Subunit: 417 residues, 4 copies
């Protein structure tokens, strides 16, 4: 019941028993564009595929997206094991040119270049799940991106990338305007002194956890795996540290984009993230997040997480349409996996942005009686959890639903049949 | 209020408003051996000077120690600003070593990736090593190694892979190349080796350390408790006050950590050496485990290797290195050790100054109250222990500027440090060795009182206390109107706690 | 944040803000027997009517029950305002008493020597020297040095000599002695039958009269409780058995009694004769504590507002004594003679309501729940804990529980929530029996069962929503907790706004 | 937990801990004799109250003289000697004057008789206290003033009365006349609570063991009522007619001792201290630390070397479970220390030593012997010791953990 005990009980000779709760985002490039490679990367644990729009034509990116969706849908014949895979568009953004950085300067470059405008509407056409907005420095930058996406792209998640000092200084207003945050350590390291970057990372991650908004750590993760089949201990420690800081997702770059071991990189990411999970002290996170929260859905979400610790439940099953209800549960960081059951394929993909959310896509048609339709979706989650090893028959799980059709404030404690 | 809020309130624009609490240990070599440089390293924050006895003669090391003390005592005229500097002897160890590179002896050769290298056991080559043939001192290597086995030379800098085996030789391929010097360390991962706790050379080195009055010993390649006991026995009665710090370098050392920790005065975590047998996805877990158990036991723990290595060639470190050092401090490390960055680098002073910056920056992320509260209910009738607890407890209540401890052996200041107060611990002592060894503990700011002993014990106490407050004011620990805690014994020749206001 | 802040905030110049949570039990006798009086007592806050079977015939008590039910059902036309009223049967129990004085009062002397005989030739010839009683086994449970109290401890004797079937005692404290007076044997392990033949008849009377609960007198051990259980048999197996602890053996063997009982009654008066005065308060706090821990109802009875038999207002000592019983954690307070035969029956009920309601302000609810949760050894009990936890954090006006046997509401009450528990049921018996638990506000639903389950749930929920707003537990805009099952024939918790 | 503490209560188990609440006895015709006073002292009387509603100054002077003859008859053994305080209770007089003419005569007689405390009747506001304070003047500036709360206005303006007073007496019998019965218990709990938080002594009086005037045993209702007063947090309990005029004054004291001792087992100390701590200077910091350390080490006692008694009062506020042995050379503070719960005042009559260190250990060792004799602790046990640092130090800012020799 102390964080000190938790560290003292760490045993490197025992395999990690809990699942890997942090999302994996892989940059797709020449080394990982093929359908066959993408299939194995999905099998190895890739949750999100990022397309870097600093280079490449729209025709080139359209094919990459096509390949990602081909590899993803090849597993669709088994809905119990089917893993949703999101598509992320990463803008080139404003540049100064050999690129130039102006440390501490309030750069007045427009939030969205002419190329970014083209790429953003291309992202709307391609039905991407989220956008990584480069070089975000203020709230008006985020809303300018939102404006370009327009009405047709209103459901596309906007992740603001913090790449300089102004972004760190004005972090609160940026966070309040964004759907999530990406911490670009590499770029941050050239804008502020290196001995202050780790402080910035912990601050931003902390405020994202407090706000219940997804935070992504990017750059300088496993870069040595571009040439090597194994990473250094320092890289394994840095990655783990980002997980323990409270990051929702971790992003790979050249390791999966152009490297010689893209598949080994994804697997090494999965291993490190799963190993770091044993050092995570869940009970303290939840109790602190509770005391820092400012509604029947909020109250039910807290109750579900609270009960998940009391019952030692194998999972928290959440029936959701937009994903919002599952997100509210994720904010409180339960140790138990959050099985988000949805019929919306987009919300299933976007759910990977939140730590601990294991999204499943229900393809069964809507049943006439509401009580029937709820039981159907729950039993679907029951089957997935059994197949994934989350829980077994006889265990207890928490289920969050709505009370009436299109009403979620209902919690029930049910045994696994 | 909460750990999460403490993180949220972190501010890279706000200047550091706290003292740097973690000790800085610098390896002394050709680039930092001079008196002029040593003075500047002390002013920059060096607390302990490590002497690596893997190379160099006793004569060479004696001059280094002399130069350290010359630079140290040049500040001794002002007792208020004087900072004690400890001397550490790092043993060569019982690890397998290569032979002499042919020629003068040193003499280095270039091993290139993909090339063939023949490892021999024929003593005709024990002083004739090069890129083609390599001699090592483990005669039984062919029986303990296999085809496909990997061999690491010079602390993991160079890696080889065995291709085929002979009666008295091995044919290998150079996997990770580099420059090879004479008598370098050889590591055989996953191999069963017969190695003594301490070598014949280590024995004469430990004796040399006693005659040179060193403060601590870094014992290399400790795998079990009996390894520490041997080092203890060699030091014997004459060196019974010399602290023994066990270096954990392999899997067995981690596996048998508890018995080693119990037998040792402290622990060094050699991450780079750990990474030889232990994969990248597990090393960080071993670090947090060993540091945690060291904190729980109240014994010093040092993080070593792979810290600011890029500063050997550059004046600035990478952000990854900054995060790595910081995470070590946040894990709960008492000290951070620099190796080649101060030993042979081009910027030994920038290395010390940067280490000071990073350690001071990381101090803002430390959540003190949770540490003490957990270390309280995790702690194993002793009047000194209860007084120590009470002093730390009161330091949080009164928001004390410091906890002043009057000590002779350091023991009293150590028991306070285990509970990790937010306020600095000013350990006032008349024992010079106590003042130097105190750097091993986080949060302890040792102070050497040179004033003679007053017969009136109450006058002697208030004299030492007034000295501590002058030190505290000068270092900016506290000012007039602040309150401090004072720990003393009750009679002349430690169960007394006093809450006193600063005038 | 602290219990002492709670005590410091206490304001006597401030009206009681919360609803009365403890049950009020009133002994119905000559002064409260009429329908007119009963109606007023019900409106004044009476939850349970106790019938003391020490006095009165079956037909006398049967008429009292009839009047209680006539009074109770006169409010049945308004289902929202209707209050269930339970009926309690209190057995006479076994008892050791003397005999007739030849002639009939005498005068005892302090320090003198009164002889105890068992010869029936003096069963009607008792006086200053010789005296007889009916416990023929008294010379096995009493020994040299034992104490013998006579007539409510008004006369104390100390055993000096043992005999074949006689005792020689010295009058420790004098007084005056009548005939057929009660005898107590402090410390002794009495072997009287668990249930006398009269109690057997009265228990069978309770079954055929459909009483809700029985207060079993003079319970010393687990087998005593099961003997009462046997008499009630199959027909009365749903009747709650509340064991009355009245002597030292009952206190010593309290655990086995509680483990065999549905509830406990603390009889302070009888306790005061059996054990020293400086220990009764400890026993009361102990027994109430273990009952709170076990989640079983506990009733404090005797010596409550006794002065109100002759006066319209109680003393400050009585007001303090009742309040402290409530603050100890008692579920119900029982009124005796001041409602049964006194001159101010409905004043005593109203005053009991006032005292209990004022005592609620000194209760530190959040402390009690956190301790009860942590000291606990099932989907329903996980949902019950979750409901109480949510009620504190939502600052809920109430916890609405759908139950048919009462069980689900009972295990919510165990964790002592601040918010009142509105137990909605169609079973009239569980509605009456629910008064035994602190904070449970039972309502009886008379609406027909809807074939669509989700519609029947909302019907009962809406009924509770109307009751709570009428009682002032909550208003529109507030948030309440709702506990239901998920299918027809309690593991579902819902957070819902008050419409 | 507090709940499990209640569950563990065993009436068959003898009270092991010492009695911590002071006992104040009203002295009258039934208890005036020296030999009866001797027995009351041995039975646990800490304070003798003189009711100046009746009797002449010559009558009360004889009573005070008898109280001191009985007290000093035990003086030949400083180890077992128990200090006994003398209390003057004014007759008293809503715009009636604070001090009547008779009261003024009685208050100045009290100064002349060197009483330790005064129970001021019918206090309704802070100005009433200031008037009593002014009467006692410079000569009686060290005499503790205990304001008696007897009416509704006194309860209303309680905060300002508490601030001006040295202590509070809850006159429950008189309270019951002016305010409804379903509110008196709330007022008592409120006043006791605020007194505990402020760290000032609170006394519950009237309607205690009244039935013991004519009977040797109290009713269970009285036993329960007295016990709950203790459990509310009262520092002292006061007997009236039971000791003043009753047939069993000695039995009344012994019963009050038993009840208070039995109620001690129901007290949940760690909750009190933790709440008192979170609802709060070198000494005040040392006081908290000593109480906290006493719980950790399971200390047999907290030894406090004090001159004015204030240091012991600071420790007493935080309600430690361990007995507070207050070692003083001042006979007055030794008698006044009984007003505070958990303080066991002891009077050192050893000559002052030249070396201040020697004089400290002398007094500490005195407490060691007193503790062993009283059964608070034994050889091998550990106690907390609070002292000043040097001669002249008013601050008890020095805490030491020391094994019992
Ligand atoms: Mg960029
Ligand atoms: Mg090595
Ligand atoms: Mg009876």
């Amino acid at each position: 019941d102390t964080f000190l005990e938790h560290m003292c009980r760490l045993d490197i000779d025992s395999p990690p028993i809990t699942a890997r709760n942090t999302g994996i985002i892989c940059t797709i490039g020449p080394a990982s564009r093929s359908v066959e490679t993408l299939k194995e990367m999905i099998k190895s644990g890739m949750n999100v595929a990022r397309l870097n729009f600093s280079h490449g034509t729209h025709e080139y990116h359209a094919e990459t997206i096509k390949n990602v969706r081909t590899a993803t849908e090849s597993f669709a014949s088994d809905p119990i094991l089917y893993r949703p895979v999101a598509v992320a568009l990463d803008t080139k953004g404003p540049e100064i040119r050999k690129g130039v950085n102006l440390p501490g300067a309030a750069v007045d470059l427009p939030a969205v270049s002419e190329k970014d405008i083209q790429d953003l509407k291309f992202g709307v056409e391609q039905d991407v799940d989220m956008v990584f907005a480069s070089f975000i420095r203020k709230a008006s930058d985020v809303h300018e991106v939102r404006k370009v996406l327009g009405e047709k792209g209103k459901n596309i998640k906007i992740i603001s990338k913090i790449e300089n000092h102004e972004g760190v200084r004005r972090f609160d207003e940026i966070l309040e305007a964004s759907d999530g945050i990406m911490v670009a350590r590499g770029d941050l390291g050239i804008e502020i002194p290196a001995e202050k970057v780790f402080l910035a990372q912990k601050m931003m991650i902390g405020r994202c956890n407090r706000a219940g908004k997804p935070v992504i750590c990017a750059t300088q993760m496993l870069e040595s795996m571009i040439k090597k089949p194994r990473p250094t201990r320092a890289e394994g420690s840095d990655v783990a540290n980002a997980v323990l800081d409270g990051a929702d997702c971790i992003m790979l770059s050249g390791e999966t984009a152009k490297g010689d071991y893209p598949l080994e990189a994804v697997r090494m990411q999965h291993l490190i993230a799963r190993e770091a999970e044993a050092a995570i002290y869940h009970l303290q996170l939840f109790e602190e997040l509770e005391r820092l929260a400012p509604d029947p859905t909020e109250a039910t979400a807290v109750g579900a997480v609270e009960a998940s610790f009391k019952c030692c439940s194998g999972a928290i099953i959440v029936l959701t349409k937009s994903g919002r209800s599952a997100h509210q549960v994720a904010r409180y960081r339960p140790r138990a996996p959050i099985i988000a059951v949805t019929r919306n394929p987009q919300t299933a993909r976007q759910a990977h942005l939140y730590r601990g959310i294991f999204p499943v896509l229900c393809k069964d048609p809507v049943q006439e009686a509401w009580a029937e339709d709820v039981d159907l979706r729950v039993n679907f989650a029951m089957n997935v959890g059994k197949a994934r090893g989350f829980f077994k028959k006889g265990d207890v799980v928490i289920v969050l639903t709505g009370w009436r059709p299109g009403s979620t404030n209902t919690m029930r404690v049910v045994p696994v049949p």
